[PDB]
Protein backbone atom coordinates (compact mmCIF):
# COMPACT_ATOMS: atom_id res chain seq x y z
CA UNK A 1 0.00 0.00 0.00
CA UNK A 2 0.95 3.31 -0.32
CA UNK A 3 2.99 4.61 2.71
CA UNK A 4 2.34 8.16 4.43
CA UNK A 5 4.56 10.03 7.01
CA UNK A 6 3.29 13.45 8.61
CA UNK A 7 5.78 15.57 10.59
CA UNK A 8 5.85 17.05 13.51
CA UNK A 9 3.68 14.17 15.52
CA UNK A 10 3.37 16.40 17.90
CA UNK A 11 3.65 20.21 18.70
CA UNK A 12 2.45 23.30 20.62
CA UNK A 13 1.84 26.43 19.16
CA UNK A 14 0.53 29.73 20.78
CA UNK A 15 -2.87 31.54 19.49
CA UNK A 16 -2.87 33.70 16.86
CA UNK A 17 0.80 31.97 15.58
CA UNK A 18 1.59 30.13 12.33
CA UNK A 19 1.86 26.76 12.36
CA UNK A 20 2.78 24.73 9.24
CA UNK A 21 2.41 20.54 9.10
CA UNK A 22 3.95 18.16 6.37
CA UNK A 23 3.08 15.17 4.85
CA UNK A 24 4.99 13.22 2.56
CA UNK A 25 3.63 9.57 0.46
CA UNK A 26 5.95 7.13 -1.23
CA UNK A 27 4.47 7.69 -4.58
CA UNK A 28 2.45 10.13 -6.58
CA UNK A 29 -0.93 11.15 -5.78
CA UNK A 30 -1.11 12.76 -8.97
CA UNK A 31 -4.01 11.68 -11.04
CA UNK A 32 -3.51 12.33 -14.68
CA UNK A 33 -6.80 12.10 -15.94
CA UNK A 34 -8.38 14.65 -13.52
CA UNK A 35 -4.89 16.51 -13.11
CA UNK A 36 -5.41 16.49 -8.97
CA UNK A 37 -3.76 15.59 -6.35
CA UNK A 38 -6.03 12.88 -4.11
CA UNK A 39 -4.34 14.33 -0.76
CA UNK A 40 -6.89 15.61 1.76
CA UNK A 41 -6.37 17.12 5.11
CA UNK A 42 -8.95 16.06 7.93
CA UNK A 43 -9.35 17.57 11.67
CA UNK A 44 -10.03 15.16 14.12
CA UNK A 45 -11.00 17.32 17.82
CA UNK A 46 -10.91 15.09 20.76
CA UNK A 47 -13.78 12.99 21.37
CA UNK A 48 -15.12 13.49 18.06
CA UNK A 49 -14.98 12.06 13.87
CA UNK A 50 -12.70 13.41 11.78
CA UNK A 51 -14.10 16.19 9.69
CA UNK A 52 -12.34 17.34 6.35
CA UNK A 53 -10.50 20.48 5.60
CA UNK A 54 -9.15 20.36 2.60
CA UNK A 55 -9.50 17.91 -0.89
CA UNK A 56 -7.66 17.87 -3.85
CA UNK A 57 -4.35 19.19 -2.06
CA UNK A 58 -5.70 22.40 -1.63
CA UNK A 59 -9.20 23.03 -2.09
CA UNK A 60 -11.06 24.32 0.79
CA UNK A 61 -14.33 22.17 2.08
CA UNK A 62 -17.45 24.67 2.32
CA UNK A 63 -17.61 26.57 5.36
CA UNK A 64 -13.67 25.94 6.15
CA UNK A 65 -12.15 29.19 7.70
CA UNK A 66 -9.25 30.56 5.31
CA UNK A 67 -6.67 30.18 8.09
CA UNK A 68 -6.33 26.57 7.02
CA UNK A 69 -4.47 26.41 3.34
CA UNK A 70 -3.11 23.57 1.94
CA UNK A 71 -0.47 23.06 -0.74
CA UNK A 72 1.57 20.68 -2.63
CA UNK A 73 1.54 17.98 -5.41
CA UNK A 74 3.00 14.87 -6.04
CA UNK A 75 4.38 13.65 -2.81
CA UNK A 76 5.03 16.19 -0.68
CA UNK A 77 2.45 18.30 0.86
CA UNK A 78 1.40 21.08 3.82
CA UNK A 79 -1.25 22.33 5.53
CA UNK A 80 -1.27 25.46 7.45
CA UNK A 81 -3.27 27.23 9.94
CA UNK A 82 -1.96 31.01 9.47
CA UNK A 83 -3.48 32.38 13.24
CA UNK A 84 -4.11 29.33 15.72
CA UNK A 85 -7.21 29.73 17.53
CA UNK A 86 -7.94 27.97 20.90
CA UNK A 87 -10.57 25.53 18.97
CA UNK A 88 -8.05 24.25 16.19
CA UNK A 89 -6.43 21.94 19.44
CA UNK A 90 -7.29 18.46 17.34
CA UNK A 91 -5.07 16.07 15.66
CA UNK A 92 -4.96 16.98 11.98
CA UNK A 93 -4.45 13.95 9.73
CA UNK A 94 -3.12 13.78 6.04
CA UNK A 95 -5.15 11.42 4.02
CA UNK A 96 -4.14 9.86 0.31
CA UNK A 97 -6.92 8.56 -1.84
CA UNK A 98 -5.36 7.99 -4.85
CA UNK A 99 -4.86 3.86 -4.80
CA UNK A 100 -6.90 2.26 -1.94
CA UNK A 101 -6.67 4.73 1.06
CA UNK A 102 -4.12 5.68 3.73
CA UNK A 103 -4.05 8.13 6.30
CA UNK A 104 -0.70 9.56 8.36
CA UNK A 105 -0.16 9.30 11.72
CA UNK A 106 -1.05 12.32 12.42
CA UNK A 107 0.15 15.87 13.75
CA UNK A 108 -1.38 16.26 17.70
CA UNK A 109 -1.71 20.32 17.69
CA UNK A 110 -1.45 21.38 21.82
CA UNK A 111 -2.19 25.05 22.45
CA UNK A 112 0.66 26.36 24.51
CA UNK A 113 -0.47 29.62 26.89
CA UNK A 114 0.65 30.86 29.92
CA UNK A 115 1.61 29.19 32.69
CA UNK A 116 -1.28 28.83 35.29
CA UNK A 117 -1.74 27.57 38.56
CA UNK A 118 -4.47 25.12 39.64
CA UNK A 119 -8.00 25.09 41.53
CA UNK A 120 -7.53 22.46 43.90
CA UNK A 121 -10.54 20.74 45.83
CA UNK A 122 -10.23 17.53 47.99
CA UNK A 123 -12.63 14.53 48.94
CA UNK A 124 -12.64 12.40 51.39
CA UNK A 125 -13.86 8.83 50.67
CA UNK A 126 -17.64 8.79 50.42
CA UNK A 127 -19.67 7.22 53.05
CA UNK A 128 -21.54 5.09 50.68
CA UNK A 129 -18.00 3.56 49.13
CA UNK A 130 -16.97 2.78 52.95
CA UNK A 131 -19.95 0.93 53.95
CA UNK A 132 -18.95 -0.96 50.77
CA UNK A 133 -15.11 -1.63 52.10
CA UNK A 134 -13.12 0.90 50.16
CA UNK A 135 -11.70 4.16 50.46
CA UNK A 136 -10.64 6.62 47.48
CA UNK A 137 -9.71 9.80 48.39
CA UNK A 138 -9.91 11.83 45.18
CA UNK A 139 -8.56 16.05 44.63
CA UNK A 140 -9.46 18.17 41.50
CA UNK A 141 -6.99 20.42 40.41
CA UNK A 142 -8.58 22.53 37.56
CA UNK A 143 -7.50 24.95 34.90
CA UNK A 144 -4.04 24.95 34.95
CA UNK A 145 -1.08 24.85 32.68
CA UNK A 146 1.65 22.88 31.72
CA UNK A 147 -0.19 19.24 31.93
CA UNK A 148 2.80 17.88 34.02
CA UNK A 149 2.66 18.77 37.45
CA UNK A 150 4.19 17.32 40.65
CA UNK A 151 0.41 16.42 42.66
CA UNK A 152 1.84 14.68 45.81
CA UNK A 153 -0.48 12.93 48.81
CA UNK A 154 0.83 13.16 52.85
CA UNK A 155 -0.73 11.33 55.10
CA UNK A 156 -0.09 12.78 58.83
CA UNK A 157 3.40 14.64 57.56
CA UNK A 158 4.32 11.31 55.33
CA UNK A 159 4.41 11.24 51.61
CA UNK A 160 2.05 8.45 49.88
CA UNK A 161 3.67 7.71 47.19
CA UNK A 162 1.73 4.42 46.05
CA UNK A 163 -1.58 3.68 45.14
CA UNK A 164 -1.95 7.23 43.78
CA UNK A 165 -3.65 7.71 39.77
CA UNK A 166 -3.94 10.72 37.52
CA UNK A 167 -5.92 11.41 34.69
CA UNK A 168 -6.23 14.71 32.49
CA UNK A 169 -8.88 16.08 30.54
CA UNK A 170 -8.60 16.89 27.11
CA UNK A 171 -7.59 20.84 26.99
CA UNK A 172 -9.62 23.24 27.05
CA UNK A 173 -11.20 24.26 23.75
CA UNK A 174 -11.61 28.57 25.00
CA UNK A 175 -8.76 28.77 27.60
CA UNK A 176 -6.33 25.95 26.75
CA UNK A 177 -6.14 24.61 30.22
CA UNK A 178 -6.17 21.28 31.60
CA UNK A 179 -7.62 20.03 34.32
CA UNK A 180 -6.70 16.64 36.38
CA UNK A 181 -7.83 14.20 39.11
CA UNK A 182 -5.71 12.55 41.53
CA UNK A 183 -6.98 9.23 42.94
CA UNK A 184 -5.80 7.71 46.29
CA UNK A 185 -6.72 4.43 46.48
CA UNK A 186 -6.41 2.63 50.23
CA UNK A 187 -7.81 -0.18 51.98
CA UNK A 188 -10.41 0.79 54.27
CA UNK A 189 -8.27 -0.45 57.01
CA UNK A 190 -5.42 1.55 55.98
CA UNK A 191 -7.73 4.72 55.38
CA UNK A 192 -8.76 4.19 59.27
CA UNK A 193 -5.29 4.03 60.28
CA UNK A 194 -4.22 7.80 59.74
CA UNK A 195 -5.81 10.96 60.43
CA UNK A 196 -4.54 13.47 58.20
CA UNK A 197 -5.16 13.35 54.40
CA UNK A 198 -3.39 16.29 51.95
CA UNK A 199 -3.49 16.75 48.41
CA UNK A 200 -0.43 19.36 47.30
CA UNK A 201 0.16 21.05 44.01
CA UNK A 202 3.89 22.49 43.48
CA UNK A 203 2.86 24.02 40.35
CA UNK A 204 6.17 26.29 38.52
CA UNK A 205 4.33 29.88 39.39
CA UNK A 206 5.08 29.29 42.69
CA UNK A 207 7.83 27.91 45.19
CA UNK A 208 4.86 27.49 47.78
CA UNK A 209 2.41 24.09 47.53
CA UNK A 210 -1.26 24.88 46.81
CA UNK A 211 -2.45 22.72 49.34
CA UNK A 212 -5.78 20.85 50.52
CA UNK A 213 -6.47 18.88 53.57
CA UNK A 214 -9.15 17.19 55.87
CA UNK A 215 -8.92 15.64 59.13
CA UNK A 216 -10.67 12.13 59.23
CA UNK A 217 -11.78 12.57 62.66
CA UNK A 218 -13.34 16.05 62.16
CA UNK A 219 -16.23 13.89 59.45
CA UNK B 1 -29.83 14.32 6.44
CA UNK B 2 -27.13 12.09 5.43
CA UNK B 3 -26.35 9.78 8.79
CA UNK B 4 -24.35 6.59 9.65
CA UNK B 5 -24.68 4.72 12.43
CA UNK B 6 -22.35 1.87 13.22
CA UNK B 7 -23.59 -1.14 15.94
CA UNK B 8 -22.90 -4.22 16.95
CA UNK B 9 -19.15 -3.40 18.79
CA UNK B 10 -18.68 -3.75 22.57
CA UNK B 11 -17.05 -6.12 24.14
CA UNK B 12 -15.79 -9.78 22.54
CA UNK B 13 -13.23 -12.40 23.56
CA UNK B 14 -10.14 -13.10 21.60
CA UNK B 15 -10.54 -15.67 19.08
CA UNK B 16 -13.21 -15.58 17.49
CA UNK B 17 -15.10 -13.36 14.89
CA UNK B 18 -17.20 -10.56 15.19
CA UNK B 19 -19.60 -8.59 12.83
CA UNK B 20 -20.02 -4.72 12.99
CA UNK B 21 -22.96 -3.28 11.10
CA UNK B 22 -23.73 0.48 9.99
CA UNK B 23 -26.92 1.64 9.28
CA UNK B 24 -27.22 4.57 6.74
CA UNK B 25 -29.79 7.12 5.92
CA UNK B 26 -30.37 9.98 3.81
CA UNK B 27 -28.42 8.98 0.36
CA UNK B 28 -28.56 6.98 -2.17
CA UNK B 29 -26.60 4.11 -0.66
CA UNK B 30 -25.95 2.15 -3.92
CA UNK B 31 -24.46 5.28 -6.03
CA UNK B 32 -21.49 6.11 -2.74
CA UNK B 33 -18.52 3.82 -2.35
CA UNK B 34 -18.53 2.88 2.12
CA UNK B 35 -15.27 2.47 3.79
CA UNK B 36 -14.16 0.89 7.30
CA UNK B 37 -11.67 2.89 9.81
CA UNK B 38 -10.67 2.22 13.20
CA UNK B 39 -8.48 4.15 15.55
CA UNK B 40 -6.86 2.53 18.83
CA UNK B 41 -7.11 4.30 21.83
CA UNK B 42 -4.73 7.15 22.05
CA UNK B 43 -3.25 5.74 18.23
CA UNK B 44 -3.96 7.57 14.73
CA UNK B 45 -6.61 6.52 12.15
CA UNK B 46 -6.25 3.44 10.38
CA UNK B 47 -7.93 2.66 7.08
CA UNK B 48 -9.27 -0.69 7.01
CA UNK B 49 -11.10 -1.54 3.61
CA UNK B 50 -13.61 -0.42 0.96
CA UNK B 51 -16.76 -2.05 -0.89
CA UNK B 52 -16.96 0.52 -3.98
CA UNK B 53 -20.84 1.25 -5.56
CA UNK B 54 -23.23 -0.21 -8.24
CA UNK B 55 -21.45 1.14 -11.29
CA UNK B 56 -18.03 -0.47 -10.37
CA UNK B 57 -19.82 -3.74 -9.34
CA UNK B 58 -19.66 -4.00 -5.38
CA UNK B 59 -15.78 -4.81 -5.50
CA UNK B 60 -14.08 -4.56 -2.67
CA UNK B 61 -10.28 -3.56 -1.44
CA UNK B 62 -8.33 -4.03 1.86
CA UNK B 63 -5.87 -2.58 3.48
CA UNK B 64 -2.66 -4.91 3.89
CA UNK B 65 -2.50 -5.05 7.60
CA UNK B 66 -6.25 -6.65 7.08
CA UNK B 67 -6.41 -8.31 3.95
CA UNK B 68 -7.32 -11.84 4.19
CA UNK B 69 -8.47 -11.26 8.15
CA UNK B 70 -11.53 -8.71 7.50
CA UNK B 71 -14.13 -8.85 4.86
CA UNK B 72 -16.18 -5.73 3.81
CA UNK B 73 -20.25 -6.16 2.50
CA UNK B 74 -23.30 -4.16 1.41
CA UNK B 75 -26.95 -5.21 2.05
CA UNK B 76 -28.36 -3.20 -0.98
CA UNK B 77 -32.02 -3.79 0.30
CA UNK B 78 -31.48 -2.36 3.59
CA UNK B 79 -28.93 0.42 2.92
CA UNK B 80 -26.29 -1.15 5.37
CA UNK B 81 -23.03 -1.99 5.44
CA UNK B 82 -20.94 -4.61 7.42
CA UNK B 83 -17.64 -5.39 8.48
CA UNK B 84 -16.68 -9.23 9.72
CA UNK B 85 -13.70 -9.21 11.75
CA UNK B 86 -12.23 -12.82 12.18
CA UNK B 87 -9.44 -14.63 14.23
CA UNK B 88 -9.86 -11.48 16.65
CA UNK B 89 -6.84 -10.24 19.08
CA UNK B 90 -6.98 -7.69 21.74
CA UNK B 91 -4.91 -5.60 20.11
CA UNK B 92 -8.15 -5.53 17.18
CA UNK B 93 -10.09 -2.95 20.20
CA UNK B 94 -10.75 0.43 18.54
CA UNK B 95 -13.07 2.93 17.88
CA UNK B 96 -14.58 1.47 14.40
CA UNK B 97 -15.87 3.98 12.09
CA UNK B 98 -17.82 3.66 8.75
CA UNK B 99 -17.86 6.35 6.57
CA UNK B 100 -19.30 7.48 2.88
CA UNK B 101 -16.88 7.55 -0.08
CA UNK B 102 -16.58 7.56 -3.87
CA UNK B 103 -13.60 8.15 -6.50
CA UNK B 104 -11.25 10.10 -5.64
CA UNK B 105 -12.09 12.98 -7.38
CA UNK B 106 -15.10 12.87 -5.01
CA UNK B 107 -13.83 12.85 -1.84
CA UNK B 108 -15.76 15.85 -0.56
CA UNK B 109 -18.65 13.21 -0.28
CA UNK B 110 -16.97 12.09 2.88
CA UNK B 111 -19.17 11.32 6.04
CA UNK B 112 -18.31 10.05 9.18
CA UNK B 113 -20.55 7.81 11.75
CA UNK B 114 -19.60 8.62 15.51
CA UNK B 115 -18.13 5.08 15.54
CA UNK B 116 -18.70 2.17 18.39
CA UNK B 117 -15.81 0.97 20.51
CA UNK B 118 -14.65 -2.57 20.11
CA UNK B 119 -13.27 -3.95 23.31
CA UNK B 120 -11.21 -7.32 22.52
CA UNK B 121 -11.00 -8.95 26.42
CA UNK B 122 -11.26 -11.91 28.32
CA UNK B 123 -12.22 -9.90 31.03
CA UNK B 124 -15.90 -9.90 32.23
CA UNK B 125 -18.92 -7.30 31.66
CA UNK B 126 -19.18 -5.24 35.91
CA UNK B 127 -21.04 -2.56 36.36
CA UNK B 128 -19.86 0.87 38.32
CA UNK B 129 -20.34 1.84 41.64
CA UNK B 130 -20.96 5.40 41.83
CA UNK B 131 -20.36 7.60 44.82
CA UNK B 132 -21.07 11.74 45.19
CA UNK B 133 -18.27 13.74 46.03
CA UNK B 134 -19.83 16.53 48.27
CA UNK B 135 -18.03 19.16 49.45
CA UNK B 136 -18.49 31.54 44.85
CA UNK B 137 -17.56 28.87 42.69
CA UNK B 138 -18.11 25.15 44.34
CA UNK B 139 -16.94 21.78 42.41
CA UNK B 140 -19.10 18.62 43.19
CA UNK B 141 -18.44 15.23 41.84
CA UNK B 142 -19.11 11.36 41.04
CA UNK B 143 -16.54 8.88 41.64
CA UNK B 144 -17.69 6.28 38.86
CA UNK B 145 -15.63 2.80 39.85
CA UNK B 146 -15.28 -0.62 39.13
CA UNK B 147 -16.48 -1.38 36.15
CA UNK B 148 -16.12 -2.66 32.38
CA UNK B 149 -15.78 -2.54 29.44
CA UNK B 150 -15.98 1.13 28.38
CA UNK B 151 -17.59 3.09 27.74
CA UNK B 152 -20.16 5.26 30.54
CA UNK B 153 -21.77 7.94 29.30
CA UNK B 154 -21.82 11.06 32.39
CA UNK B 155 -24.12 13.91 32.35
CA UNK B 156 -25.10 16.42 35.64
CA UNK B 157 -28.67 17.14 35.98
CA UNK B 158 -29.93 14.66 32.56
CA UNK B 159 -27.33 16.78 30.08
CA UNK B 160 -28.82 19.92 31.29
CA UNK B 161 -25.59 20.78 33.60
CA UNK B 162 -22.95 20.68 30.74
CA UNK B 163 -20.60 23.91 31.32
CA UNK B 164 -18.14 23.88 33.58
CA UNK B 165 -17.84 19.84 33.88
CA UNK B 166 -14.39 18.05 33.85
CA UNK B 167 -15.21 14.19 33.11
CA UNK B 168 -11.79 12.02 33.37
CA UNK B 169 -10.82 9.48 31.01
CA UNK B 170 -11.03 6.06 32.77
CA UNK B 171 -8.09 3.98 34.43
CA UNK B 172 -7.83 0.28 33.84
CA UNK B 173 -6.57 -1.36 37.37
CA UNK B 174 -7.06 -5.36 37.23
CA UNK B 175 -9.43 -5.43 34.38
CA UNK B 176 -11.65 -2.98 35.65
CA UNK B 177 -12.20 1.25 34.76
CA UNK B 178 -12.31 3.77 36.87
CA UNK B 179 -13.32 7.69 36.42
CA UNK B 180 -14.13 10.20 38.02
CA UNK B 181 -16.37 13.12 36.69
CA UNK B 182 -16.67 17.50 38.54
CA UNK B 183 -18.74 19.95 37.69
CA UNK B 184 -18.00 23.56 39.37
CA UNK B 185 -21.20 25.62 39.92
CA UNK B 186 -22.21 29.03 41.48
CA UNK B 187 -22.39 28.62 45.11
CA UNK B 188 -25.94 30.27 44.47
CA UNK B 189 -26.69 27.15 42.68
CA UNK B 190 -26.38 24.70 44.86
CA UNK B 191 -27.24 23.20 47.76
CA UNK B 192 -30.72 25.92 46.45
CA UNK B 193 -31.17 23.88 43.36
CA UNK B 194 -30.92 19.86 43.15
CA UNK B 195 -27.35 18.83 41.09
CA UNK B 196 -27.32 15.09 40.08
CA UNK B 197 -24.85 12.89 38.25
CA UNK B 198 -25.93 10.16 35.80
CA UNK B 199 -24.17 7.33 34.66
CA UNK B 200 -25.20 4.91 31.88
CA UNK B 201 -23.14 1.93 31.29
CA UNK B 202 -24.62 0.51 28.20
CA UNK B 203 -22.70 -2.71 28.53
CA UNK B 204 -24.26 -3.85 31.26
CA UNK B 205 -27.49 -1.88 30.82
CA UNK B 206 -27.19 0.02 33.79
CA UNK B 207 -28.33 3.44 34.43
CA UNK B 208 -27.47 4.91 37.85
CA UNK B 209 -28.56 8.40 39.29
CA UNK B 210 -26.95 10.28 42.34
CA UNK B 211 -27.70 13.67 43.91
CA UNK B 212 -24.87 15.47 45.76
CA UNK B 213 -26.27 16.11 49.44
CA UNK B 214 -24.06 18.47 50.96
CA UNK B 215 -21.79 16.68 53.82
Known amino acids: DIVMTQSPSSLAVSAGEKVTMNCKSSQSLLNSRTRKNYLAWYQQKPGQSPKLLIY???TRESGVPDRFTGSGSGTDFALTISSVQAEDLAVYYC????????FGGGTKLEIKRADAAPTVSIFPPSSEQLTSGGASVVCFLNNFYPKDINVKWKIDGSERQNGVLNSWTDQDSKDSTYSMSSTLTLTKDEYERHNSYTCEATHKTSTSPIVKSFNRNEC | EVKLVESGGGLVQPGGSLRLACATS????????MSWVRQPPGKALEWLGF??????????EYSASVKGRFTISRDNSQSSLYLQMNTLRAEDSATYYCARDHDGYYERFAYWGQGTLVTVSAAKTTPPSVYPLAPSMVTLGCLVKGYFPEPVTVTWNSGSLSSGVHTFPAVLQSDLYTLSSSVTVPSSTWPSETVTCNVAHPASSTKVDKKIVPR
Open chain 1, 95 to 102: KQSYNLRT
Open chain 2, 51 to 60: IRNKAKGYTT
Open chain 1, 56 to 58: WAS
Open chain 2, 26 to 33: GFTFTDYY
